[PDB]
């Protein structure tokens, strides 16, 4: 297990760690999060009590270094940093743990939720979507725009998701206009899977990362990307069976974890109704259809 200490908590803030969250009061003696499960990426996120504008946070993997959080009063935010002095870091963590100034990552042994939401998400792929090579961890916030959004303005602060556009030459072979517009299988299997992503695991990892950024930060461009990656599969007549069954699992856990009161803003009615009831794969997502119909029947 690993630990992300905090130097201090000078401003009142809601702190999230993966799907969990805790409120911290101004100058409360809070000094970090311990017992973080090794083997997965994680996200530590923030929403200031005095300004719910900008949710922001950091994707990280404790296998890649020793990370801590320190508030910067000039830039006004909690910043992740890497400590290169290993013995210094261990001494800090030990003293904070000995004083019981840290919250414990509250994972239930039976509970595979986080694994299910991050199964295909790798830190190395996160760092190619969020480009800041000097750090081993990646900052995302509520307002960051995607490369696709920018095309339709600060490039160094963009989310470099793979651009999906159903009315583009990339998606439509000359001579197959009707075929490829009505059946996206070419675009999915040859252009996206074989060409860009190389395999379905990388495709699913980006889909999962997009969902998580939409949910945890309210990042709109990420929600657009998540829906586009779903629609691309569902609108393809020819999809490998292992991908269809894995997609049903991925979406089931995403829909299960979504806050009930955020459905109006995080779910696109057109995409979900098309995917579950009209598309080629309308009958291939049994688990997702069942949870959607029982949890959000209004959307449909």
């Amino acid at each position: 297990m690993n630990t992300v200490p905090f130097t201090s908590a000078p401003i009142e803030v809601t702190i999230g760690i993966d799907q969990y969250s805790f409120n911290v009061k101004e100058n409360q003696p809070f000094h970090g999060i311990k017992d973080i499960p090794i083997g997965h990426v994680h996200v530590i996120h923030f929403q200031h009590a005095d300004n719910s504008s900008m949710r922001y946070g950091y994707w990280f993997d404790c296998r890649m270094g020793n990370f801590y959080i320190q508030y910067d009063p000039k830039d006004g935010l909690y910043k992740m940093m890497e400590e290169r002095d290993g013995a210094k870091f261990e001494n800090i963590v030990h003293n904070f743990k000995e004083r019981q100034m840290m919250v414990s990552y509250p994972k239930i042994d039976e509970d595979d939720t986080w694994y299910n939401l991050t199964e295909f998400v790798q830190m190395d792929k996160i760092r190619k979507i969020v480009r800041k090579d000097e750090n081993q961890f990646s900052y995302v916030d509520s307002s960051m725009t995607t490369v696709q959004e920018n095309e339709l303005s600060d490039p160094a602060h963009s989310l470099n998701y793979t651009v999906i556009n159903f009315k583009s030459r990339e998606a439509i072979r000359p001579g197959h206009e009707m075929e490829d517009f009505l059946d996206k299988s070419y675009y999915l299997n040859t252009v996206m899977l074989q060409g860009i992503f190389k395999n379905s695991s990388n495709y699913f990892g980006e889909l999962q990362f997009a969902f998580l950024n939409a949910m945890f930060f309210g990042n709109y461009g990420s929600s657009l990307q998540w829906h586009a990656m779903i629609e691309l599969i569902c609108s393809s007549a020819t999809v490998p069976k292992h991908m269809l069954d894995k997609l049903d699992e991925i979406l089931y856990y995403q829909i299960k974890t979504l806050p009930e009161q955020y459905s109006d803003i995080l779910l696109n009615e057109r995409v979900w109704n098309i995917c579950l009831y009209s598309s080629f794969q309308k009958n291939s997502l049994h688990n997702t259809e069942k949870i959607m119909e029982n949890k959000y029947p209004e959307l449909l």
Binding site: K167, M178, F181
Partner: protein, 237 residues
């Protein structure tokens, strides 16, 4: 955006544009089979592509062989329309290519946009205008060439005859729309209005009779009366 009443004069500016109407591409008759089921029989159709400023009409005849062995024909017809409009654009010299294509039916938007991807600067626009171009097959010479076709064919016409020698494009489009609306509303009566006077003939190279300016005023008034009469008949008004 969409072409409507507010931006009506745009149709007659110097930016090349074409209307595309697909209402006569896929034409069928419905009939009973020997076993008492229902079947369709296709007849030749056409794409109606018109420059409203100049009157140039690119009548692409859609021969029934196009449909042989194909499924979902009403859907395919929109894609075939878009394929043929794209082919027409590519065949035109650059300085003759349109800057906008206005589709009369919004279901043509996606098929045409997809076929026109190589032309990103040609705007594909819908219209809120109810345009009577489905009645093109009530123009005898157009119907005749479509029905006689034995293979795909493009035929070029000026749908305004020589009217632009005497009237503006605006007025010519008004006249055309009135005539087509009357033909759509009561074809038999509209044709009687146009053909009743034997001394007024249609030139070999024209579609409509050779009316003088004063005769066109009378004809247009008779067409308006026909449209109003039919409205009263339909709505019991």
């Amino acid at each position: 955006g969409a072409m409507n009443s507010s931006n009506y004069a745009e149709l007659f500016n110097n930016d090349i544009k074409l209307f595309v109407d697909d209402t006569n591409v896929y034409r069928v008759t419905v009939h009973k089979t020997f076993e008492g089921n229902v079947a369709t029989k296709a007849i030749n159709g056409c794409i109606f592509t018109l420059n409203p400023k100049t009157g140039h009409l690119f009548l692409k005849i859609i021969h029934t062989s196009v449909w042989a062995g194909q499924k979902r024909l009403s859907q395919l017809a929109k894609w075939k329309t878009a394929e043929e409009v794209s082919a027409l654009v590519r065949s035109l010299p650059k300085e003759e290519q349109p800057k906008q294509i206005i589709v009369t039916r919004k279901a043509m938007l996606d098929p045409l946009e997809v076929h026109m991807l190589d032309f990103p600067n040609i705007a594909i626009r819908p219209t809120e205008l109810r345009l009577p171009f489905s009645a093109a097959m009530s123009i005898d010479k157009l119907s005749d060439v479509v029905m006689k076709a034995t293979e795909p064919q493009m035929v070029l016409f000026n749908i305004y005859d020589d009217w632009l020698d005497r009237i503006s494009s605006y007025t010519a489009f008004s006249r055309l729309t009135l005539l087509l609306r009357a033909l759509k509303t009561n074809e038999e009566s509209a044709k009687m209005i146009l053909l009743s006077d034997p001394t007024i003939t249609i030139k070999s190279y024209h579609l409509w009779p050779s009316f003088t300016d004063e005769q066109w005023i009378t004809i247009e008034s008779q067409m308006r009366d026909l449209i109003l009469t039919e409205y009263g008949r339909k709505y019991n008004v």
